[model samples]
Target: HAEGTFTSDVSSYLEGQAAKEFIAWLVKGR
Candidate 1:
């Protein structure tokens, strides 16, 4: 029997994008 765990670089990339969007929205008031 074998167990495996996987991780994705895209998750972090998307998280970074989400943060940028949130900050833009916060400052731009849009």
Candidate 2:
């Protein structure tokens, strides 16, 4: 496991399919 701030977490998510999921979450939430 890793400790993460927003920038670090974004880096991790942006490398995988989770990046798309993350963006979808933001679009839906906003």
Candidate 3:
């Protein structure tokens, strides 16, 4: 497996489904 900061992972997530999930989480928690 890989280590360190997953910039690409975060990037892909932000550019894909994780963005919506993140927004939903933020809204739900906030």
Best by TM-score: 1
Question: What is the per-residue lDDT of model 1 for residues 1-30, given as tens digits with 9 covering 90 to 100?
Answer: 122333355566678778876688788885
All models: lDDT?
Answer: 0.64, 0.69, 0.68
What's the true lDDT of residue 17 in model 2?
54
For model 2, give the RMSD to the true fold. 7.8
Ranking by lDDT: 2, 3, 1
- What would the TM-score be for candidate 2 when compared with the true structure? 0.27
* Cα displacement (Å) at residue 4, model 2: 6.0
On the 0 to 100 scale, the lDDT of residue 15 in model 3 is: 84
lDDT of candidate 3? 0.68
Which regions of candidate 2 deviate over 4 angstroms?
1-5, 18-30
**For candidate 3, which ten residues in a row score worst on lDDT?**
1-10
Clash counts for all predictions: 0, 0, 0
Q: Across residues 1-30, which tens digit of lDDT does each residue of candidate 3 receive?
A: 255466667667658875676678877886
Error of 3 at 7 (Å): 0.9
User: What tens-digit string does per-residue lDDT give for candidate 2 at 1-30?
Assistant: 355645776676668755676679888887
